[PDB]
Design an enzyme around this catalytic site. Structure first.
Site, mmCIF file in Angstrom:
data_model
loop_
_atom_site.group_PDB
_atom_site.id
_atom_site.type_symbol
_atom_site.label_atom_id
_atom_site.label_comp_id
_atom_site.label_asym_id
_atom_site.label_seq_id
_atom_site.Cartn_x
_atom_site.Cartn_y
_atom_site.Cartn_z
ATOM 1 N N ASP A 15 0.862 -1.248 -0.055
ATOM 2 C CA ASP A 15 -0.148 -0.107 -0.244
ATOM 3 C C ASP A 15 0.801 1.310 -0.053
ATOM 4 O O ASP A 15 0.354 2.240 0.020
ATOM 5 C CB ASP A 15 -0.976 0.052 1.159
ATOM 6 C CG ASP A 15 -0.225 -0.052 2.416
ATOM 7 O OD1 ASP A 15 1.086 0.204 2.570
ATOM 8 O OD2 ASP A 15 -0.901 0.019 3.631
ATOM 9 N N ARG A 29 1.030 6.667 -0.029
ATOM 10 C CA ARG A 29 0.166 5.781 0.317
ATOM 11 C C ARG A 29 -1.070 5.777 -0.503
ATOM 12 O O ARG A 29 -1.521 6.583 -1.311
ATOM 13 C CB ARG A 29 -0.589 6.213 1.756
ATOM 14 C CG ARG A 29 -1.520 5.573 2.173
ATOM 15 C CD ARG A 29 -1.122 4.132 2.651
ATOM 16 N NE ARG A 29 -2.005 3.385 3.578
ATOM 17 C CZ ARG A 29 -3.122 2.856 3.173
ATOM 18 N NH1 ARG A 29 -3.470 2.801 1.945
ATOM 19 N NH2 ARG A 29 -3.934 1.972 3.888
ATOM 20 N N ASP A 34 -6.897 -1.063 1.605
ATOM 21 C CA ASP A 34 -5.944 -1.635 2.776
ATOM 22 C C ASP A 34 -5.554 -2.834 2.385
ATOM 23 O O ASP A 34 -6.555 -3.671 2.091
ATOM 24 C CB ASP A 34 -6.758 -1.733 4.172
ATOM 25 C CG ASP A 34 -7.208 -0.345 4.674
ATOM 26 O OD1 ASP A 34 -6.260 0.509 4.706
ATOM 27 O OD2 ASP A 34 -8.291 -0.173 5.456
ATOM 28 N N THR A 35 -4.184 -2.963 2.114
ATOM 29 C CA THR A 35 -3.763 -4.254 2.057
ATOM 30 C C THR A 35 -3.409 -5.150 3.143
ATOM 31 O O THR A 35 -3.125 -4.140 4.350
ATOM 32 C CB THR A 35 -2.292 -4.260 1.067
ATOM 33 O OG1 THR A 35 -1.548 -3.378 1.711
ATOM 34 C CG2 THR A 35 -2.590 -3.935 -0.157
ATOM 35 N N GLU A 37 -0.343 -6.174 5.552
ATOM 36 C CA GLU A 37 0.899 -5.581 5.878
ATOM 37 C C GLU A 37 2.114 -6.614 6.067
ATOM 38 O O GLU A 37 1.757 -7.981 6.463
ATOM 39 C CB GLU A 37 0.834 -5.080 7.416
ATOM 40 C CG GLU A 37 1.711 -3.537 7.223
ATOM 41 C CD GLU A 37 0.371 -2.608 6.634
ATOM 42 O OE1 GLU A 37 0.182 -2.558 5.623
ATOM 43 O OE2 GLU A 37 0.007 -1.957 7.562
ATOM 44 N N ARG A 81 2.955 11.409 4.140
ATOM 45 C CA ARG A 81 2.979 10.535 2.845
ATOM 46 C C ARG A 81 1.954 10.947 1.927
ATOM 47 O O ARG A 81 0.704 11.509 2.314
ATOM 48 C CB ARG A 81 2.309 9.190 3.233
ATOM 49 C CG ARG A 81 3.194 8.374 4.097
ATOM 50 C CD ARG A 81 2.896 6.797 4.260
ATOM 51 N NE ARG A 81 1.813 6.758 5.132
ATOM 52 C CZ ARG A 81 1.053 5.780 5.466
ATOM 53 N NH1 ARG A 81 1.507 4.506 4.935
ATOM 54 N NH2 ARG A 81 -0.039 5.856 6.090
#
Length: 135
Positions: A15, A29, A34-35, A37, A81
């Site tokens: 991500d 970002r 949402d991937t 982690e 980010r």
């Protein structure tokens, strides 16, 4: 919205990617997704994290052209980010991950939600197809 060119510096996670943008190195970002982690603040290396991370990496490393597309809201988060849609040869990385079941659509915050419906459609298809996260 409009697309600007950037150059890969380093892929960091499914991500997050480091790009050269308007002359300066910057961490981006990916908006709306949402991937799992590999470097999770609390967990560690979650399941499908390594595969989300190799997919982002390959897709961007193998592109001729990378472009960044900001949304209409704030363009940076509290960690400094950049918040953007990233495109590899015209293909949005954010949607590719969701279409493959390697990311979920995140909690959304107006007005940074222009491609929300599009991604939600891709997530519904990945779900129906039982891919990856959804199997």
């Amino acid at each position: 919205l409009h697309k600007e060119p950037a150059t890969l510096i380093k892929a960091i996670d499914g991500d997050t990617v480091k790009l050269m943008y308007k002359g300066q190195p910057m961490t981006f970002r990916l908006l709306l997704v949402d991937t799992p982690e590999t470097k999770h603040p609390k967990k560690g290396v979650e399941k499908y994290g390594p595969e989300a991370s190799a997919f982002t990496k390959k897709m961007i490393e193998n592109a001729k052209k990378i472009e960044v597309e900001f949304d209409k809201g704030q363009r940076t988060d509290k960690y400094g980010r950049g918040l953007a849609y990233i495109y590899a040869d015209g293909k949005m990385v954010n949607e590719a991950l969701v279409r493959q079941g390697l990311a979920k659509v995140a909690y959304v915050y107006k007005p940074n939600n222009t491609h929300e419906q599009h991604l939600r459609k891709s997530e519904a298809q990945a779900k129906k197809e039982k891919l990856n996260i959804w199997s």
